[PDB]
Design a protein around this nucleic acid. Structure first.
Lengths: 104, 248
RNA sequence: CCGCUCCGGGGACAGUGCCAGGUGGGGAGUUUGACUGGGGCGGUACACCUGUCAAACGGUAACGCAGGUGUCCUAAGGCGAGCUCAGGGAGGACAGAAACCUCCCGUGGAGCAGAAGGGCAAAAGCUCGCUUGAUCUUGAUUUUCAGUACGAAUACAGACCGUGAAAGCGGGGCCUCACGAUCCUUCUGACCUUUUGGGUUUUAAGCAGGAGGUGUCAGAAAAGUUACCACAGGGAUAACUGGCUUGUGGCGGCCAAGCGUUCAUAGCGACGUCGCUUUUUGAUCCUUCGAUGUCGGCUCUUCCUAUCAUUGUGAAGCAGAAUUCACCAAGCGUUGGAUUGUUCACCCACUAAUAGGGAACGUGAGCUGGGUUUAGACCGUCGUGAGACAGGUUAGUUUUACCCUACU
RNA sequence: ACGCGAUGUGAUUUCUGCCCAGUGCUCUGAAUGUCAAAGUGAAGAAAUUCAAUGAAGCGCGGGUAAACGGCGGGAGUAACUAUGACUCUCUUAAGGUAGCCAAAUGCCUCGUCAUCUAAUUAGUGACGCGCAUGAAUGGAUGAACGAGAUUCCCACUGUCCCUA
RNA sequence: UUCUCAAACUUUAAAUGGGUAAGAAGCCCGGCUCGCUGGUGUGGAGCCGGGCGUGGAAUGCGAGUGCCUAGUGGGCCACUUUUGGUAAGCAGAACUGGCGCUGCGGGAUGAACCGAACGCCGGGUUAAGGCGCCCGAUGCCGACGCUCAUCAGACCCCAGAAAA
RNA sequence: GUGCGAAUCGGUCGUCCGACCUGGGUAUAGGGGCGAAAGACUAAUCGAACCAUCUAGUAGCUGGUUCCCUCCAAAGUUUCCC
RNA sequence: ACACGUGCGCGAGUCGGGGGCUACGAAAGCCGCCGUGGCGCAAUGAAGGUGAAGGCCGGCGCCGCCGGCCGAGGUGGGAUCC
RNA sequence: AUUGGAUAGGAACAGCUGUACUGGGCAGUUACAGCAGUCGUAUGGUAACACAUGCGGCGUUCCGAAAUACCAUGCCUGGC
RNA sequence: CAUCAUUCUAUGGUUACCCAUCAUUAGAGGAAAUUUCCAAU
């Protein structure tokens, strides 16, 4: 799809519509001291082999691309996630489609 | 799931050597003052056949230099040694056949046999029938001697260590073709339980990694890793090359 | 004589103790979906949408029919304005069937991303203008439905907004599909809660909302082989017979275009059409899986007629002879061999003739064991392999009657 | 080391062709990607985090088939036709060489020809575009041997005519 | 203009069918409340308090409500509708009734067809089927025809035939 | 072929100076042995002996599940589920 | 162990079951400054925690708080009773 | 300068006869001429439809950029 | 009419700091040789 890098939408803290800054969400690096990852290693260590499932039956090919909305007004600077439907190709303000233009 | 025959070989019990009629250990005389500072003389009592071994052994009888007792030794008999011959042995011995003096004190190009590898281990190298080692070069700094071994490997050796001069007796017995399975039966019956060799492809796939199949084939490369575990280590073990060995 | 290592060869390395990485079917454990006109192979009828089936509420099945789906869209979302489309007719330099320009007809015959259906004309289409209601937030409801989730949806309400003069309209796509629990991870939010004797600070843990995904789509973490096989079962299910059925096979009618020098019908009968049969194969799964001995031959009886010969006859395109068609007809015959395990076929030779069949595809406590069809082996192709092969090859235990009946 | 251990093939004879692309195996670490603990260095109040470094192996590069194994398809072409030496193209790591063959290996198939028979899906001898032959996954042979598997002939005979 | 069609065509368009309504929670005045809606005690809703019982189609019938709960979750058949299939005692659906769970009379004999459902008995009477004899009942002076077969015909499901 | 016999009997065969036959002693023990290789043999047991225990192992699968009368009386369908 | 039904006791409580005191009796009886304790009498939130009727009349047509008195809803249907 | 189509261009073949390339011939190839064979066609005969008779035109299958050694000439044979 | 250099002013200019340059991060794009063009690249 195509989403612009600017978006005049609602800011929760401000309590109004203010112009936001759109950027694609990525994951963070997995903390080694998250309780789950700590529990995992205590269980995984020693003998017993692999203790929890390894998912292999990978079915779907694309993600629900998420936008990281960021308030521009510099007192607030509050953010939230904005999940959009599944799409394969994705760009932020690439090239606006035009009309009456020749496909050469 | 069955253990292969080679793993069964290590236990012994059945695969042990047949050492009932084996006429003692074929040892080179012990080092003493009269091997180190000069020579000691012994008589060749009788050249004698040892079961399983191809070379004849020589009962050589020395006289004990400290007691009034007389000392009998079992040398690997050098080709051309005879009974009622005097065998000399020591640093100041003479360089003719059947005569065991240290390797440092004999010239380059000298054919030896029953050669010690580490000095005073009573003779280890080139003591199969017909085999010989050549002294190539000496090194009075470090006191060391390159000696070519029957395989073709030149190995550095500590000059102080000893070898009967000449080639081992019973030489050239591998030139005669054993005509018949019974002659092979009789050979290995004097040695150990190894002979009637069942090839792994003819075995079942539980006994040997090559067994099984509706054709009698291997289905994996016969050439195998050195690191491979006991039970899989079968075929051509760590084979650098294979096929008809062309050139040198 | 004097001594401090018994002499010699190594030597701070071998090596051992402990961690760490790699290798590791040599061993270990375990797995190797499901549906299914038997299983497999193939498909997905496994999650989901359209028209039909569906019997004019709704609902309704099959590996029913015709299809579609795992997307796509910063506009193809949101208003507002102005326009009218497909196609046709008539004209117009170059200009032709097709470029562009006008005028006329034009109920949608176009278009609305895609499947199909529905819907649609001062629009829902076309072209422009501004935009981000595709945002934030409680509940209620509908659809599937257990009246549970999910997805999707519908009406509100509270915010904040866009648009337009305004009425309004908008919380994604004109409607009907395009999707995802717990656990875990990750991000986001608040001068948030707890980090346990108190305090500060990192850190961790919570609360709330998105995301990473389970397509077997209410969501295990998973390769084969067995002819060396085992067990619990199953006639819920295949491999015989028997049933039903008769496509196919076989056999027989009907009509009469033609064949037959002539002449539809002596003998034939195309284009069509009605049957019969169960010596073919299918189709099915009813009986049998605490077992009905699963090919052929040999032997032996009986039976059928759809008659090859023989008895009696009718018709011929019947002069005789030989041969054809048909009738009453199963009394009596229907052989000896080469090759093949063969049923089948084929040939030789004899013959009045060398018809076709049934009886659990008659007949293994009647035989035989040649073939298939266990375990041994060889080959070819196939597989990394174990192994596979209605692919050849060779070797491979044929049990019991003295019971009842039947018959003698 | 004329030894021990591990494999394949299977006496003699005569041979053993081509392929190192794949899969192994093996040799090389001095231009070096990936790489663990430890160690080192920095940032921080510290836990920690980050960076450099960095063994074997893997990657990269040689070797090796008597290692596992593998060893093409399509057109046109001789002055009767048939065949096609020759040519053209596609194409591989190499395109099956010497041999052998409807073999215990050939689906079609009871192949075609000859021979054996009165008659032979059997047998032997040939012919090979060989479903799917082939060279120590050994090829071709082969005297002697065989309670091996076939076919024919002589002799013999109740196997049979056909039973007593 | 004319011939012939459509499960995935349709202007029309049934029968059978599916909702709802057929009163006291109704009707009827009158006042009160509201922050909702507003030109307007407008609109709407919500409250109090009065007055109206010919109980407002037929027929039948006492209803309401809540806990705990087994077995079951292989079905099968028939009329009509209906899908695949040449068909099938085949496979799959709709409606209702059966069988399963069920005897009984009749269909000679049958799970399901026809009649009819069952405590143990006496009398009476029928259903569906019958009434030569088996075998209860035509042993009526039954009515009118039809038919001759050297293969007669003879009673739902049903157990054997067509074109000609 | 309910045997003489849980492998025997007859004729007929193979071999019979050698990889010959054989008695005693001795070694190898169960995922082990041993195997001129047939998954053969390991005490009538072998594609993992036998014995005792864990153990009354588990079984969505077979089989059975014991007196009488009285009343009421089904379902083989829905949704989800390796 | 749990759920529901039923019977009995007591009832905002209830219960000694553990402990103790005094042939059948290893019973029965008793304790109350032996109710420790269980379950019930209070819920809800992850947690810090918080934790279960009001109206009217006056002192300053509307006041933060002074006091005053009555004070645990309403509609409809409801066996019984009046 | 990778490329990617096209279409520009080379190739392998062409049912028989007749005539011309020669000093003269055996063959080709090519030019061609007439039938075949393709293509249209109108009658003659239909119940069918598929032929028949006559007239008028008429190569294919491959390979991009070629690429072909030498090309249509290869041979045999007569010079006192 | 266009552009640069100059000073004069203007209620104007952030000074722990402005701008041209040096650099890296954030987007848009070709003529020709090669022909016979096409749309690329």
């Amino acid at each position: 799809v195509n989403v612009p890098k600017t978006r005049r939408t609602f800011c929760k803290k401000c309590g109004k519509h203010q112009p936001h800054k759109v950027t694609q969400y990525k994951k963070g690096k997995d903390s080694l001291y998250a309780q789950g990852k700590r529990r995992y290693d205590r269980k995984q260590s020693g003998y017993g082999g692999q203790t929890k499932p390894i998912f292999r039956k990978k079915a779907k090919t694309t993600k629900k691309i998420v936008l990281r909305l960021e308030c521009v007004e510099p007192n607030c600077r509050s953010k939230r996630m904005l999940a959009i439907k599944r799409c394969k190709h994705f760009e932020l303000g690439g090239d606006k489609k035009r009309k009456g233009q020749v496909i050469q | 799931g069955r253990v292969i025959r080679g793993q069964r070989k290590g236990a012994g019990s059945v695969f042990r050597a047949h050492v009932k009629h084996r006429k003692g250990a074929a040892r080179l005389r012990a080092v003493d003052f009269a091997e180190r500072h000069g020579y000691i003389k012994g008589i060749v009592k009788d050249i004698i056949h040892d079961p399983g071994r191809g070379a004849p052994l020589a009962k050589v009888v020395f006289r004990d230099p400290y007691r009034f007792k007389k000392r009998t030794e079992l040398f690997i008999a050098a080709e051309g040694i005879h009974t009622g011959q005097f065998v000399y042995c020591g640093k100041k011995a003479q360089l003719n056949i059947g005569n065991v003096l240290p390797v440092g004190t004999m010239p380059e190009g000298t054919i030896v046999c029953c050669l010690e590898e580490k000095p005073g281990d009573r003779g280890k190298l080139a003591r199969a029938s017909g085999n010989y080692a050549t002294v190539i070069s000496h090194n009075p700094e470090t006191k060391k001697t390159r000696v070519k071994l029957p395989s073709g490997s030149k190995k550095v050796i500590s000059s102080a260590n000893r070898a009967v001069v000449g080639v081992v007796a019973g030489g050239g017995r591998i030139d005669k073709p054993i005509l018949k399975a019974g002659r092979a039966y009789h050979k290995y019956k004097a040695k150990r339980n190894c002979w009637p060799r069942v090839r792994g492809v003819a075995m079942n796939p539980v006994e040997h990694p090559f067994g099984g199949g509706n054709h009698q084939h291997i289905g994996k490369p016969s050439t195998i890793r050195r690191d491979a575990p006991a039970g899989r280590k079968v075929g051509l073990i760590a084979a650098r090359r294979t096929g008809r060995l062309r050139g040198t």
